[PDB]
Amino acid sequence: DQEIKKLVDQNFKPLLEKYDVPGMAVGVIQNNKKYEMYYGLQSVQDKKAVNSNTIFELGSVSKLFTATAGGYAKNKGKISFDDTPGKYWKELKNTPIDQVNLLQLATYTSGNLALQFPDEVQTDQQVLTFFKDWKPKNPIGEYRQYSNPSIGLFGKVVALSMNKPFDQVLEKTIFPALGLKHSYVNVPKTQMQNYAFGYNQENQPIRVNPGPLDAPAYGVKSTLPDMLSFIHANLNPQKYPTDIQRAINETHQGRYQVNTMYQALGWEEFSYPATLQTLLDSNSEQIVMKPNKVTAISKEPSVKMYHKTGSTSGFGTYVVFIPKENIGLVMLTNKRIPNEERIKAAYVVLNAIK
Numbered sequence: 001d002q003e004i005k006k007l008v009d010q011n012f013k014p015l016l017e018k019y020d021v022p023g024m025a026v027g028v029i030q031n032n033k034k035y036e037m038y039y040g041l042q043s044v045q046d047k048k049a050v051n052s053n054t055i056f057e058l059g060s061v062s063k064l065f066t067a068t069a070g071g072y073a074k075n076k077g078k079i080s081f082d083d084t085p086g087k088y089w090k091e092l093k094n095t096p097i098d099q100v101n102l103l104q105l106a107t108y109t110s111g112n113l114a115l116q117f118p119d120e121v122q123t124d125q126q127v128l129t130f131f132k133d134w135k136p137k138n139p140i141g142e143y144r145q146y147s148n149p150s151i152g153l154f155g156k157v158v159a160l161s162m163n164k165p166f167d168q169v170l171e172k173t174i175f176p177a178l179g180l181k182h183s184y185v186n187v188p189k190t191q192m193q194n195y196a197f198g199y200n201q202e203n204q205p206i207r208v209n210p211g212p213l214d215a216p217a218y219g220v221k222s223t224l225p226d227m228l229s230f231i232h233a234n235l236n237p238q239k240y241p242t243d244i245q246r247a248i249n250e251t252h253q254g255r256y257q258v259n260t261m262y263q264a265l266g267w268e269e270f271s272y273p274a275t276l277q278t279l280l281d282s283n284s285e286q287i288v289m290k291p292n293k294v295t296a297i298s299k300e301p302s303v304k305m306y307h308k309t310g311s312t313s314g315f316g317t318y319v320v321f322i323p324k325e326n327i328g329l330v331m332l333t334n335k336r337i338p339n340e341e342r343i344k345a346a347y348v349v350l351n352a353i354k
């Protein structure tokens, strides 16, 4: 038990000197006990320490909240995953994108959506026009290409289905249901002093810029204690209201496989125990940047683990949990470090406990 601080100090702390990272928060949850380790500074210029109030940008870990919101809407009957976006976004009815179902948008298999929108797309009108003018390339449902606009559109449709803007879906419904007290799409005036600076590869202070459908794709900010509560909810959904319990369980169901990686809703899913290289290969150039033909799930793993990475220009995130061991880990940094280093450090810590 005294083990956990020592393991995090051994495996995470050296990454600060190695990549010149100003600040880091590492959390472990084991048998419903939380451990919070804080290193360095939230702000270099203000000499302000990382602490339990420090707000970090989650980047792509935001996609897990979008997935949870989708699972909540589905199990309340507001949407079906067999529906197409035109059923909710009326101006997309009978357009080519209206042949793609909500699951295919959520799990990046439209067959023609890249990582980013084109830089030129900024306004609400430019976003609509982009989806109106969309045409298929690969057969729909057959090719995974990891995509912000794909899950972004899924998020916008989930919001329309609940008759609230996406920011209010998370801040008024999903975050309260999960018992999160300091998680935001928009950080309010009263919390700006707790919002860390991110640092770019020149160690210049930076925060995420507004972008098209940013909120559902990479737009959430949170604290270490909130993210440990979120991992707690994913490990122990029974303790939570029926609505959010079903939502969470919906995010754990694998939909297809790309070799050893199973794509669930937001979460990446693996057979446990997974080899280090299985976890590293999940975020290789091949999987993250290029199209990959999917297979149906053949081996449905009895014992599963889940992870997700997140990056903004100034922040790095990693979350992993293993239901069978009742254990999980959160890493938040205010400078990006390679995905490899995040996954490897978490692997050694979680394999040395129990």
Ligand SMILES: *[B@]([O])([C]N1[C]=C(C2=[C]S[C]=[C]2)N=N1)OP([O])([O])=O
Binding pocket: 058, 059, 060, 061, 148, 218, 288, 309, 310, 311, 312, 313
């Ligand atoms: B998500 O946050 C996807 N992602 C990364 C970026 C980016 C990093 S630096 C400039 C832009 N934009 N969207 O993280 P990932 O799944 O790649 O870990």
